[PDB]
Amino acid sequence: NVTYQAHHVSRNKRGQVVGTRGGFRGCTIWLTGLSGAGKTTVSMALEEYLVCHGIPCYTLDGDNIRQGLNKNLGFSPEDREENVRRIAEVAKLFADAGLVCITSFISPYTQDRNNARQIHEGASLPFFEVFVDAPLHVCEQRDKGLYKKARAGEIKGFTGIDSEYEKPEAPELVLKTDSCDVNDCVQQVVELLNERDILP
Amino acid sequence: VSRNKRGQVVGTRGGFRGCTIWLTGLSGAGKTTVSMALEEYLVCHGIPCYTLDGDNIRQGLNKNLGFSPEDREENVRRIAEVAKLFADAGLVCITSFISPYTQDRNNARQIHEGASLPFFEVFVDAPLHVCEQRDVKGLYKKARAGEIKGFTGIDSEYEKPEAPELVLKTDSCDVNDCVQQVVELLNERDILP
Ligand SMILES: Nc1ncnc2c1ncn2[C@@H]1O[C@H](COP(=O)(O)OS(=O)(=O)O)[C@@H](O)[C@H]1O
Ligand SMILES: Nc1ncnc2c1ncn2[C@@H]1O[C@H](COP(=O)(O)OS(=O)(=O)O)[C@@H](O)[C@H]1O
Ligand SMILES: Nc1ncnc2c1ncn2[C@@H]1O[C@H](COP(=O)(O)OS(=O)(=O)O)[C@@H](O)[C@H]1O
Numbered sequence: 315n316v317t318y319q320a321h322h323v324s325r326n327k328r329g330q331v332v333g334t335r336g337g338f339r340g341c342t343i344w345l346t347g348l349s350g351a352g353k354t355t356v357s358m359a360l361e362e363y364l365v366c367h368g369i370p371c372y373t374l375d376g377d378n379i380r381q382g383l384n385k386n387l388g389f390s391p392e393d394r395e396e397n398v399r400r401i402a403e404v405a406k407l408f409a410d411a412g413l414v415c416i417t418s419f420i421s422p423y424t425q426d427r428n429n430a431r432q433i434h435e436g437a438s439l440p441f442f443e444v445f446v447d448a449p450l451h452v453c454e455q456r457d458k459g460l461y462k463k464a465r466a467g468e469i470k471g472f473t474g475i476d477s478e479y480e481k482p483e484a485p486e487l488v489l490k491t492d493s494c495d496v497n498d499c500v501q502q503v504v505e506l507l508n509e510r511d512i513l514p
Numbered sequence: 515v516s517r518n519k520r521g522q523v524v525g526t527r528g529g530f531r532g533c534t535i536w537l538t539g540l541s542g543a544g545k546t547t548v549s550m551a552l553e554e555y556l557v558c559h560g561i562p563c564y565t566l567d568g569d570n571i572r573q574g575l576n577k578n579l580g581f582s583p584e585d586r587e588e589n590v591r592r593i594a595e596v597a598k599l600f601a602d603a604g605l606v607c608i609t610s611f612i613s614p615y616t617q618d619r620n621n622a623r624q625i626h627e628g629a630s631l632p633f634f635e636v637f638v639d640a641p642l643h644v645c646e647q648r649d650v651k652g653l654y655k656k657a658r659a660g661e662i663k664g665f666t667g668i669d670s671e672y673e674k675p676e677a678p679e680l681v682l683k684t685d686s687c688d689v690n691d692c693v694q695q696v697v698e699l700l701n702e703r704d705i706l707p
């Protein structure tokens with residue numbers, strides 16, 4: 315017996331109030347990829363760039379989320395489904411609020427990344443899937459603690475070893491972090507945000 | 515990026531004002547009414563905010579929860595964690611959930627205060643008979659007809675706050691009277707200029 319309550323404030327007014335030299339630019343930048351591939355690195359520099367150009371944003375990192383909102387979830391397929399589902403719902407509120415939301419979660423199931431997109435596109439919010447792509451071995455020698463414990467059978471169902479990572483087929487962007495610079499990665503994301511009319 | 519750097523790019527006129535106004539009270543007490551009219555004020559005055567309403571949130575993030583003691587605990591736990599992210603992002607976050615249990619509201623507080631973010635517990639306080647009279651959604655009559663079990667105030671409990679930052683007597687005040695009480699507490703804590 316739950317029935318929806320409408321807001322009094324439109325997106326257009328929100329974009330007037332949040333962003334200086336306004337225009338509503340609420341969206342979500344969804345980073346996806348193996349552990350140690352470069353998602354958090356890339357998302358924190360993107361957040362830095364954005365704040366330095368007067369564009370309000372927040373970063374939701376799986377690791378951070380997973381000690382607060384999702385502290386009660388593990389790494390079974392079903393928990394990762396629910397991990398991703400909740401954060402898709404959270405990110406949708408941030409883009410609806412007027413902010414560029416940046417997420418950095420492994421998010422290893424295509425079905426779940428597509429659901430996250432539909433949550434946004436349904437609500438007429440732009441959703442940018444960015445594949446952060448570093449070869450497994452590169453991600454592994456970058457590690458500290460986890461890959462080692464996982465090869466020893468102390469972390470069961472670890473993405474890339476024991477559990478599969480499902481690659482996006484045709485994302486908005488692929489970031490080759492083994493051959494690409496941190497600033498260069500960030501610039502590519504900005505270039506995308508330029509065309510897609512988020513950054514002036 | 516630091517909170518200080520956020521407050522110079524988020525605000526329409528500078529200074530970090532991230533915080534959570536947390537409304538608690540009976541069904542029909544006036545939570546949604548106040549929060550949305552409060553959301554209207556803050557926006558028209560150049561202050562970015564966002565309302566998280568228990569009914570809307572239960573359509574999305576919290577759609578896999580019902581009204582058991584434990585589910586109400588999880589409902590409130592999740593939105594407290596979300597509200598601390600909006601706060602930390604520099605927005606004034608307005609939540610309006612029944613949040614019937616004092617243990618869970620104190621937990622939502624601790625979540626915030628342990629991140630050094632302001633938390634204002636606002637008791638929206640109309641007695642049951644008043645809320646029942648209004649019965650805006652037909653829920654009280656349905657509850658008393660035996661069509662809804664464990665309804666707050668009838669077959670489950672509401673636990674009143676012990677040290678709220680603000681009580682609003684919606685039975686003796688009008689919407690705007692109530693909105694202004696809120697703003698003046700916000701003025702007091704340098705959230706609103
Ligand atoms: N272009 C790049 N992008 C991201 N990380 C890089 C890059 N080049 C080198 N690195 C290194 O790779 C590591 C990236 O790890 P994280 O950002 O922590 O990965 S994450 O995907 O699990 O979030 C950092 O230690 C960083 O110094
Ligand atoms: N079994 C595991 N698989 C992958 N990551 C794990 C596992 N156990 C712990 N972790 C830690 O959790 C982080 C990833 O969490 P998420 O991005 O939240 O995962 S996701 O698959 O559900 O999206 C990793 O970077 C790693 O530090
Ligand atoms: N001062 C007041 N503040 C808020 N609501 C009031 C006030 N006076 C009367 N009301 C009325 O009481 C009803 C409260 O219902 P809701 O706002 O929907 O309450 S809620 O707590 O269940 O969210 C509304 O129809 C509202 O117009």
Ligand SMILES: Nc1ncnc2c1ncn2[C@@H]1O[C@H](COP(=O)(O)OS(=O)(=O)O)[C@@H](O)[C@H]1O
Pocket residue numbers: 315316317541568569572581585586587589590610611612613614651653662663664665666
């Ligand atoms: N058994 C019930 N008790 C109270 N509210 C209910 C119940 N069933 C449906 N509702 C509806 O759901 C709303 C309560 O949602 P919340 O604010 O999210 O409650 S809370 O107790 O878990 O915080 C009420 O406004 C009412 O519309």
Ligand SMILES: [Mg+2]
Pocket residue numbers: 319545546569610
């Ligand atoms: Mg309500």
